[PDB]
Design a binder for this molecule. Structure first.
Ligand SMILES: [Cu+2]
Lengths: 260, 317, 260, 317, 260, 260, 317
């Protein structure tokens, strides 16, 4: 718990710096859960974590491995049926509560944040088969999202193999015409080399910030499509008091954060 | 925290011309205390699905606060088989109202909670429920808290020839429920049947919870299997012991028959009704006055006996 | 307890004698309730009472005045949300479980079993406004029913003012013509004089029996339409044991069965 | 069943010149309701071990009902550090009294329950507790509900040279305790500390139990681990909600400070005291009058908050 | 919270500084209670509070006004019958566990620690009658004790009117001469001016220290007998952190520590 | 469950015919427990069974094997500490409640009911060693008893090998002089051949009644000392309705009652 | 914390010579896992009061680990009428043993927990229990850990002409009891009756608690009412699932009758006995080995059925 931070910790901290206080956060396990746990503990104490299996207002002790773990179930405010969860994300949109933020993952992504986590290749005869959609599709249809992605050139494609989670589709106006809620979409992309954002008026991806261990060119070199890296700023290393927290309080067993 | 006085809860969240939803089922865990406050506050033009109603909706109607009512059933089952003020006010042509079955009312709210674009059911066909609209399309085009169409007939996309009854889903404004325990952050616990209480709390834009007791956010989480609604869904917790009186509250108290009978005969006429509302609602400053007016031994004797779940006099057993 | 049974008692015991061991009985309060109780406790110990509030497999101690009464709630096998009761009855049909028998009631009844419980006279400006559908509409659409009525000529009409709960409509094929499940409908009608059934081929009501207190003629004098009272048999008076029972255990408080 | 009214319980089991025992510990689960009835009934010449007493024994003494008192401590700890009527009445030389330690009082009752021929202890030596008798042997020879000797010194049969203090064991006449739940057959449940309540119930010739609630013989037996005294030991169950007021009752209600303060200053003088006893005891017909006199919201606000075990105002949390 | 500490606060913090980690502390309410609380919460987190009612290993949230207070009861590790508390303290001695430290108090105190809490003047016709022994008699017979007293000349006498709780009697061998456990007795005396101890060889009390507010002389002017105030040292004023604490957490209601 | 009653059932029924209603009954397991269970169920419904391990007001379902079985523990009114039980039997004597009856067993017995269940032979070097006293001694010191005994001549001795449970000692006045409560003693002896009683004025044993399967001479022949059999009457066979009860409801598993 | 393995704990707090006390009642809640380690460790020359003793003291006796045994009753009640190793060794003249009535034994332990100088009882008189000493004054005098006098007749200081039996209060070095839950600080929860368990954990100088499960300190305090012993009285806490096997353990499992039957026959001879011990005790490295030897399903089929409190096969219900 010192100053030798890992790339995952850099990400998990950067995630946690985005959770405003009081907002509702949909997460799974993995890095977003770590980040949620860290904001929950320091940056935004009254934010509320909710998971797709219907577990409401979570506060885990030992970190959960799956979103239906007793690690969550026994440490939540309300244990609801899955259906009420979907009922919840939709109503938030209807209520215009505008306080929900969600995390999704994936294997490929494109300039407009459309994500694929179903399969690589032809969907009928795929090179590689993943689990499929899960609740990712509901989340990306009705929630403002933060996308967790590996920064490989082969993942940042001009066009993906399957859109399991709909982003800004094709630019301005795209979502509404496909009959998707228009004022909810991909907010930020967090990869292992930094954070990317989507233009407010063109919806196209641009580099927002890069980690100390990376640079705009590193970013450009590992992206299958062109980016506007000329606007990116370097983020700062994780506050050591936090890295201590992640290692000692949050994930001592190194289930998602392994030390050097 | 979200703990607030009744006067403040109501004044802030409940407004005139609002589509409201009141929890409870006839004479069981109805949010009476909140109804009285809405009344004193002069809140009017309320439109809402009655659900399996009783005294609570009767009193709003009789006091002329309801702009549009969506009925399915209204009574203090066991005492007054038909809410006298509701029937008189309708027969006299003062109450604008619609009729769906109780099945379709409860399914309506729940479909709202679940977020369905509309509710498709194969109920209500071949009956007056579809033959006749209590509120016409011409009238509905003026009511902003009511859909233009009572319903529509549409084909089952997967069973040609068969037609289903598509009912519009309610966009509830405020939900007011009465639970046995809640906590400063919103987390509510309803012991026993929730009826439509969780659906409305989830679906409503604003939800208010009056409760018999407030416990701490930490105590309520020690066993999350007793909870029913997460606090992100509640906007105001209001401490109101016996706030469901004279309707029962599971685990705590039984219904006050004597008080239900009084209301029964008193509501037979608007003259007596208004008199009743003056003494018990408008003349009383608050819920504590109401409680003291009733009496200590009164409330004590309503108490649920462990083992039965309802009150009886063990001193005769 | 003794030889002086009331009309209501006659109806209750008659209702109890219609229940079969193993069947699911939908009830409310009143005579049907007193009927189910007496069956459960005497005639068919293992039948399962269910009410429209969502309280499944009920066994009350003291009689409930309502369907949501704690007297039912604290004494049932499971408390389900209202909507699951609708779904249950629908599924019962879909499964072709054939075991459900539901009780209903109303203000008027026509020769085909159709019942009115909403209002008498012009629906939009009624002479007499009642509660409304309740869940009887649902029960009528999907369950074999036993209708309860007061034997009054103004009640038994040819054309009722409003059809709240659908019966056989107009005759064979009617329910189908209207879109209602075809293999389900009015099976019996119990009133203060006897039990009337529905013709297998014409679905038109006819007197199947009459209480020791009535006669085929009295029934006629009180039915506002033509009845075939040629097949009617006379039922026997209630057995003291069951009267003792009803009085001293099922309803000693005379909530419904107000004893002499 | 053994369920009976307070008036009847007292009149039948409690008599003048009786060695009584009252359960509770200072301001916790004291059987006040029963004390009031004993008073109205004019029961006098009561001799009994006070135990860790407070208002209950103070009031009997002040009303001059106690023929012989066996003290160890008397106060409404936190309010009145010394039961004013007890001290005045003793200093003025009206109260015949003895002093043992609290340790030896509790050990005395328990030894009674256990059936020991006498209690041998190595406590009270080298102190005023053995040096001086509050009731002399000459006085004791006239008191029939008191042993001739305050105690004796005897040798330890197994440790020569060492002498032990042999205290006489109490032969209690009537024990009156207040429990949270009892049942028609006597079975009692005391939630929390029993203090001396079970010892006295077991030892007493007659025991009376006032309770917050009566449940059925079948319900109370469903989990026998919550029970404390078998019914063969109880003679009368008396329903008396809040019958321990103003002393706390574990799991239910906290102490009424405001009422304790009133008694504090009121008892400073016999004039005011008698006035207080006229209004709250002699002018009141029964326990229901007492409850109604207090007020609905009054009692409600004494309520124990789950998680704390004592009352606080969650609407300020 | 600030620099203006009260006399009572001085006594409480001084009491807290006498508690040791791991020891069993017998208390009641008042300053000793405030003393144990501050120790438990600050100075000795793992000491175990026990009261004479039978509530073992206590940890109150809001301060109890009594020893049977639900404020103790609902917050302890075990609720034992009164008699088991007597037996515990006796056994503690018999085992020679040597860890128990009990607090007591009274109306008068003599040079050997003997204390009176029963009555002032002729016992049979007192000038001032108090509650009586309580369990202090028992505590005095078997536990090392810290006596609390008000520093008044009429309190500190040569011969007290009544010995409720035995101390060192007359000097070495006295307790033994009287039949009281010999290796146990008055250890300290805390009052509003300083702490007085008992001479190892003569068991006669002498001033061991005095508060910043007092002086060896003031102590003398207020002791009704000859004191050796030649070894006395001056204690330091209470630390704000502990005053803040006492005021804002241990007793914000000022039940005992009535703040300025 | 017919008319072929066993000798044990004859005994267990005869035992049960002695339990008056409302009285308190101390029993173990074995025949007395069966008998208690039968009276409890039919002859004396409100009698109360208590066992020496402190289990108060018992109502077993499956019969217990030992007096501390969960079979008793989970089906009693009050679970008290052993000591309170002894406290109870004594107080009953002090209260003069005169409603307690108790069962004891044993290997030998003499004219005055003194029983031995400790050892056969010299107590220091015994031919046969039993468990010892258990609670038998308390029971026979403070309770009116019923003694369960085998009717062998070698068990009915003029003088036993050890008195673990004191009867009438030596006749009139014997008990009090030994310092034993004088108005509590052996009430009845129940063996496999009938019931024996003790003279009211001489305390000596005499035959009271013999079973159908036995006779006074059978009794005399299997008794080591003389008896007054000339006063005995024949008991009647067990009511078949009861034998059905013992076999079906009470002990279906034949733990203490084996069928033919 | 006080959490330590059953090997470490037994080695540290138990020693030959010791006057021990074992919790539980016959085939109900006996500390078996522990009694196994005592044997397995060559611990010997122990003295103790049996209480309602079962196979536990039989195993110690038969394995010649008892110098003097204070007795009231010894039988694996139901299965073995009179323990075999026990009656054999005593019959052989190979065991030093005293007999007291069971009442006196449970009292003796109680008076010890209490702190009494000695125990006066009006029991055992006029019985051979006073007319015969098991351990003579002559042998008692040469024994460490055994009173020089079994009892002493003494006058009743308050009832002249009357004498009582005085009994020495025992000094217990180690107390071993089995409970359902315990915390790392020693707080112990025993569901159901406790027998002598709480007394001997208060009396004994050192106390070892084997428990089915261990819960956090924060947790076990959530409801103070369920705790039976304060951490202070407890030295070693050991996690030992089914540690009472083959005996019952309220709310968890029923006795293992087949097993107790094996032991019943096995213990009829020293050979069969020693053979048995070599397999079940001496040959196994630890308690886990014992559980595994037994096998999963075997343990599962001993579980208590909620509502019944014991085990019944419900698939045949
Ligand atoms: Cu060693």
């Amino acid at each position: 718990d010192y100053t030798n931070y890992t790339n995952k910790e850099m990400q998990a901290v950067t995630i946690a710096k985005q959770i405003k206080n009081g907002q509702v956060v949909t997460v799974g396990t993995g890095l977003p859960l770590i980040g949620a746990s860290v904001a929950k503990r320091v940056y935004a104490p009254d934010c509320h974590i909710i998971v797709e299996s219907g577990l409401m207002d979570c506060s885990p002790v030992e970190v959960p491995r799956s979103v239906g773990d007793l690690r969550f179930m026994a440490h939540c405010g309300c244990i609801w049926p899955n259906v009420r969860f979907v009922g919840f994300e939709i109503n938030e949109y209807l209520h215009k509560a505008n306080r929900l933020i969600a995390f999704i993952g994936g294997a490929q992504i494109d300039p407009y944040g459309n994500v694929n986590s179903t399969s690589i290749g032809d969907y009928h005869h795929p090179k590689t088969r993943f689990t499929g959609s899960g609740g990712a599709n509901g989340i990306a249809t009705y929630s403002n999202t933060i996308i967790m992605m590996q920064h490989e050139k082969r993942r940042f494609m001009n066009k993906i193999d399957y859109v399991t989670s709909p982003g800004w589709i094709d630019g301005p106006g795209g979502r509404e015409r496909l009959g998707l809620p228009g004022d909810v979409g991909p907010q930020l992309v967090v990869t292992d080399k930094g954070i990317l954002k989507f233009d407010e008026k063109t919806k196209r991806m641009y580099l927002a910030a890069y980690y100390p261990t990376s640079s705009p060119e590193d970013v450009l070199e590992n992206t299958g499509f062109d980016l506007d890296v000329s606007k990116a700023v370097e983020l700062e290393a994780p506050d050591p008091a936090v890295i201590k927290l992640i290692r000692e309080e949050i994930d001592p067993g190194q289930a998602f954060i392994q030390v050097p | 925290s979200k703990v607030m006085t009744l006067k403040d809860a109501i004044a802030k969240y409940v407004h005139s011309g609002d589509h409201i939803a009141l929890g409870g089922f006839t004479t069981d865990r109805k949010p009476y205390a909140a109804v009285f406050e809405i009344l004193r506050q002069g809140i009017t033009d309320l439109t809402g699905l009655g659900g399996a109603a009783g005294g609570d909706w009767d009193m709003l109607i009789g006091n002329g606060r309801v702009k549009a009512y969506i009925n399915c059933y209204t009574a203090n089952s066991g005492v007054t088989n038909v809410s006298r003020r509701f029937r008189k006010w309708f027969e006299a042509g003062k109450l604008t109202m619609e009729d769906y079955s109780q099945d379709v009312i409860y399914m309506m709210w729940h479909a709202a909670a679940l977020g369905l674009p509309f509710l498709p059911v194969t109920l209500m066909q071949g009956s007056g429920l579809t033959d006749e609209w209590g509120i016409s399309k011409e009238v509905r085009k003026t009511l902003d808290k009511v859909p233009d169409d009572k319903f529509k007939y549409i084909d089952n996309p997967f069973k040609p020839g068969e037609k289903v009854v598509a009912v519009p889903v309610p966009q509830v404004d405020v939900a007011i429920i009465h639970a046995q325990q809640a906590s400063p952050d919103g987390t509510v616990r309803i012991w026993g049947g929730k009826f439509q209480d969780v659906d409305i709390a989830e679906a409503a834009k604003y939800t208010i919870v009056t409760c018999e007791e407030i416990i701490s956010d930490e105590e309520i989480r020690r066993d999350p299997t007793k909870n029913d609604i997460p606090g992100m869904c509640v906007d105001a917790v209001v401490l109101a012991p016996y706030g469901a009186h004279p309707s029962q509250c599971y685990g705590l108290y039984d219904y006050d028959n004597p008080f239900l009978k009084v209301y029964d005969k008193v509501s037979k006429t608007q003259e007596d009704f208004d008199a009743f509302c003056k003494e018990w609602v408008f003349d009383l400053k608050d819920h504590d006055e109401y409680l003291n007016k009733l009496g200590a031994t009164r409330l004590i004797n309503l108490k649920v006996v462990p083992g039965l779940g309802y009150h009886i006099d063990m001193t005769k057993e």
